[PDB]
Design a protein around this ligand. Structure first.
Ligand SMILES: O=C(N[C@@H]1c2cccc(O)c2C[C@@H]1C(=O)O)c1ccc(Nc2cccnc2)cc1
Length: 167
């Protein structure tokens, strides 16, 4: 039993809700919140900008030190940093950004990072301003992630479309 509330169950291990991931993180305080990161951990907009704003820019400060030490992430890769006031940990995961021409096959590699964590609160990778089809992202999530994932979808219209089209 965990504290995630109001989710629709899609599969044995994948759950989905129309929710603001920032508000959901603040209420649940999950062990792991996933950020829709880029390779530079520059959290300017979309989910990343929202999460970073909620940390009063502490996520960005920590991220800049991480990059200065380690260099950029790989597309499809991840790193674990602090969850600040939102979660114990933040798993920064880089899905391919279609508006940069990155290979969408890398989306499966991106979701594989979730398997290193037993339970996660997450957005749909590569959705939103990353330009991929969210229906496709949900399919890859279901077919790749084996650990317990609670997906937060900000847009109600998109949430309803994802549920209604789910196979
Ligand atoms: O980018 C965001 N979502 C994407 C989006 C947006 C629109 C249509 C879409 O299909 C998608 C897919 C993505 C998703 O749903 O994950 C997002 C989520 C929460 C948020 N929280 C917040 C907002 C304002 C101030 N502070 C915190 C901000 C942005």
């Amino acid at each position: 039993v965990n504290s995630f509330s109001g989710y629709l169950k899609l599969t044995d291990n994948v759950y989905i809700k129309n929710a603001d991931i920032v508000e959901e993180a603040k209420k649940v305080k999950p062990t792991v919140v996933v950020n829709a990161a880029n390779v530079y951990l520059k959290h300017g907009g979309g989910v990343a900008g929202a999460l970073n704003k909620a940390t009063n820019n502490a996520m960005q400060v920590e991220s800049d030190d991480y990059i200065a030490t380690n260099g950029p992430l790989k597309v499809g890769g991840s790193c674990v940093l602090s969850g600040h006031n939102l979660a114990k940990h933040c798993l920064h995961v880089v899905g391919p950004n279609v508006n940069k021409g990155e290979d969408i096959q890398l989306l499966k590699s991106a979701y594989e990072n979730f398997n290193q964590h037993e339970v996660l609160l997450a957005p749909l990778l590569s959705a939103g301003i990353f330009g991929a089809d969210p229906i496709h992202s949900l399919r890859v999530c279901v077919d790749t992630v084996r650990t317990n994932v609670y997906l937060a979808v900000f847009d109600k219209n998109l949430y309803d479309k994802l549920v209604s089209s789910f196979l």
